[PDB]
């Protein structure tokens, strides 16, 4: 590992390794090896996200690195990448344009970690999601997944569907309105079975993992088609109760109201734990790039 | 309808009207001599264009870009009035520069140093894909980027 | 370097590189045959381009637009292999379409139906003036609108 | 007369006629001939000006016409001109693009009167200015003029310099900062003498007519060059007192502060009377188009 | 006739009458009967449109009425309607909310003419369209129509489909992208045959009347689906040439670029004439309400 | 050294010293002396610049300091300076008002480093530019310079012209449009020869160092004078090819399009290396203030 731009940058072997390092770092001992000691990572979030900025910041600090960075704001991505190369030993970037990280990674000598590019990918988030799943079931092979909500414009879904190709899912249910369906291009990449469906109550009873993404108003024919459809891609307390005893509900946070807040008190709610592995998982990805 | 060439490249059998687009596709537009005829008779095509570039032997790489708009074209390399190679055109694997990505949020549609690149996905009905954003384009989008 | 024409127009003595711009200036880019050679030897110019348009005898009006970028050019009209008119180029009085007005607040720079029109003010060092807003342009601005 | 797009549309003969009709209409009798009776004029002020809208409106009403119009606000000028041609018998238009009226006049069958196009012309305003001058001196030939302020971007100056070519001015002083000088193109059109000068106190003593235009901040290297220069292209009470006994000061209104308000009480102030001839002059131009 | 809120307010008999009066008023004699003499019509365009404001204004003036009105700009529609009832003898209104005119017409004692409500209807525009068609073919029965572009959110299409039910069209082709299809509710009202189709070159050869509406970007999944589709719902010069010798192309103006401007020079272009009947048609509708 | 507010704060002796320390720090060893250990520098960028913020930040960290700071956003400069004096051991500030740093430096007990004040100065940037030049030619005396673009409102030009007075340039060509000329005040300070010129192709063949600054639209009579002039103050690939074998092109980044991007592949392009010395040069200036 060097550039982390796509979920395809990871092999199954690299992922099993990152999981083991995440176990170790989780068990938050005061002797973690400071593999980034004397190194500066720059966090270049052209498109802001405080949750994710702070999460990489804390990983980098836990490993002994110094952090520089910016958040927001006619200078070329290439010129900025060049400058960060004078100033730092690696870059974590978040950008509004698809492919931005790919392109930075080709300009750049130091590693570049994609923390979100446009609607294309967010690979570290996918690593966090599968880490949470494998932690719960001691496996990823054999599981039955359902992705619920917007599956067309969500980079986390794109990264999760791609990373799952390093594993053997039994089946991935794609549950969305007709409008928010996974694009053809992305479905032709996959090497595991998938089935499109409009209502989650049809198959909720079968699914090991339910992964939800927000539907946004700002994305519809008119406000009336959104108001008619919005209601049935929420994770309600009733949809939670119809899931199997051992199943989990996942969501890459923040949330607004796509999850009934009463759900956070059930044992199936796992999105809180999911956000909590973010730091050790990113420490591990960083350890695989700089410390091996 | 144009004279014989001592050294260089002859591109025959281009669809009528598309010689100017063949030159663009090759980056040509200084030093060397060029001749074209447009809309001349072709026994197999009805009509056709012909381009002749003195003093430049076109590579197989540059020549395969010609298939994006003139898949029937034939390329002959000429030395001392004699044809020394009839090149076999293939569909190119990668296309940098000639084609833009129709996604306005692709880094290639916004940063000048970020040069558009498409990798061919299927030759058959031709589909190509942006290496930055995975947007797909077909023969129709291809041809109307270049013939405009 | 190209064959003799039965009927039409031969435009010889174009500065090397400017044949494509001569075609644009004439509105040409369908039906009829065309041939060009670019960068061939000229005894008086060093290098030159030549354009041949079958089956079209260019008017004096269209031909005078050619002087905006190829003032040395010569135009021959051809019937049955014989030259029947060597046209005397003059500087055009009016130019609609080919040239844009550099004033972004001119109605011609904003309304599609408002076609740009320049009237020649002096031939001598050539200055032309927009008929809508009176902005003046010189040979240099002229030539870099057309050779781009 | 038909289209009034440039001050060049008027001959010396047409102007002497308009002056006589303006005398008659001024002397505001209750028997004015209603030459626009049964006619609708549309006032199409794409770029608004209430002063001028109301002025053409009142002229058109004084002559018995109906008025329709609009003020302000992706539809082509050509389509609008076409529509006004269904709805009306003539058009008075004001536009932000140079040449707009010229172009309308070529699309249009009914007459088109330019009431301002971009920075190019305002011909009716020039007719009003020379009417005021000829009224005062019984002549325009032989006078010594000075134009003061911005002479580059003021369409009223452009129309006044062009209309004066139908007459024989002794001399036209052009008094501006270096930046706001009359353009070369416009000076080569003129057929009478002109002299450029930076300070008005150099020649104020010689001038029959002083015509002033505002200098705007929004037009300078920086705010400091404007603050240094602004002061000496105002018509001050002192610059007024150094003018000859019989001279007049003119300004196409509105004003902000380019004229000391104490000047409005001197006999040389003529800008109030100037705005007051606007309506009869436009009635006359309308009478020459529709009533002869 | 009294309130004109829907195209359903007209019978076939009332329409044939309006056509005859439109013939008469077109032939623009100087003896038109001033049926609105002493009456004030208020034009209440809560949602502005200058083209249509001026058009009703001119109709009302041609008939001898006085006009008052406003354009634009927390006061209740009901209170405004009440006030116009003190001030006037009828109301022409344009509003952004569907059903607004219907509701005004129930509050109001004087007539109310809907000149556009939301995305619901514009009945006078439909009357103008069928007037143009009947003028050309001496009939509306038996014709083959095609509506091209946005058929879901265009109030003129809604009013044209409804008014055509007073006649016997042979067939109405509905040609739109999948997204911009006529709503189910509106299709179940119709009493004549209709067929949905995605490309106009499939049936252009058959159609007597082609009526086009703009597709707007601001209405799509993403800008890429719009850029892919936009091109083939334009009336191009080539699509015009493949239509029959006697056919006509119609568009309720303004246009931006849904019609190639070269088309305006063909004999099949009829949108210019169509806008030109607007005034006599509205004079006729007004004559049926006030003068019979 | 203590306050660094003007390029005049440096002597020739202090500059030769800073160059030697920059050599040492460049050669980026892992034993740099942590002269700022236990010290906090505050970076007070009232006017933001991320490139320069990060550059001082990294210098300060490389030397063992802690960084606090802000970027952007009715509190007096004097009160802010006072507060930073409670919180820190030195201040690097960037401000929109000319003289701001001068004034802070008089309120403040801890050192104040001007990283840009208004259009007045940026002294550390000038130190970086001469460092790059002296590195290349083993000298600054005897060179022939040309400054190209905007020379009136560019604080980097002002700081470079002033710092060059500690040296003996053969000649400094000032190449700008008439509008963007170096101010009289600044030219009377200089103690070396200078010559004003409008086109760079006149003397490009003579110049050791070409230093370019952007011309901005937002600074002109009208957009047409800018569009006419802009083209010939770009560093084109052709203007690069006409320079001597040993010459260098410099630009204080970021750039937009005042440099043809093909130039970045020639050996004469030195602006990339120039930005890369920023950190060691600022480390050296900091070492001269705190570590001697
Ligand atoms: Zn792309
Ligand atoms: Zn113009």
UniProtKB/Swiss-Prot annotation, chains A, D, E, F:
The broad enzyme category this protein falls into is transferase
Its EC number(s): 2.1.3.2
Which positions does UniProt annotate for L-aspartate binding?
Answer: 155, 214
Coiled-coil spans are none
What is one process in the GO biological process aspect for this record? amino acid metabolic process
Cite the annotated pathway: Pyrimidine metabolism; UMP biosynthesis via de novo pathway; (S)-dihydroorotate from bicarbonate: step 2/3
Where, by residue number, does carbamoyl phosphate bind?
51-52, 94, 122, 125, 253-254
The reply on keyword Transferase is: yes
Domain of life assignment = Archaea
Catalyzed reactions per annotation:
carbamoyl phosphate + L-aspartate = N-carbamoyl-L-aspartate + phosphate + H(+)
One term of GO molecular function: aspartate carbamoyltransferase activity
Presence of keyword Metal-binding: no
The entry's keywords: Pyrimidine biosynthesis, Transferase
Q: Which family does it belong to?
A: Belongs to the aspartate/ornithine carbamoyltransferase superfamily. ATCase family.
Known partners and oligomeric status? Heterooligomer of catalytic and regulatory chains.
> What does the UniProt function comment say about this protein?
Catalyzes the condensation of carbamoyl phosphate and aspartate to form carbamoyl aspartate and inorganic phosphate, the committed step in the de novo pyrimidine nucleotide biosynthesis pathway.
Protein name per Swiss-Prot or TrEMBL: Aspartate carbamoyltransferase catalytic subunit
Question: What species does this protein belong to?
Answer: Sulfolobus acidocaldarius (strain ATCC 33909 / DSM 639 / JCM 8929 / NBRC 15157 / NCIMB 11770)
Curated annotation (Swiss-Prot), chains B, C:
GO biological process terms, alphabetically, are: 'de novo' pyrimidine nucleobase biosynthetic process; pyrimidine nucleotide biosynthetic process
InterPro entries named in the record: Asp_carbamoyltransf_reg_N, Asp_carbamoylTrfase_reg, Asp_carbamoyltrfase_reg_C, Asp_carbatrfase_reg_C_sf, Asp_carbatrfase_reg_N_sf
Q: Which UniProt keywords apply?
A: Metal-binding, Pyrimidine biosynthesis, Zinc
Query: Sorted alphabetically, which Pfam families does this protein's record hold?
Result: PyrI (PF01948), PyrI_C (PF02748)
Binding residues annotated for Zn(2+), in chain numbering: 101, 106, 130, 133
Cofactors (names): Zn(2+)
Describe, as the record does, how this protein assembles with itself and its partners: Contains catalytic and regulatory chains.
As for family, the record states: Belongs to the PyrI family.
Query: What is known about what this protein does?
Result: Involved in allosteric regulation of aspartate carbamoyltransferase.
- Provide the protein name: Aspartate carbamoyltransferase regulatory chain
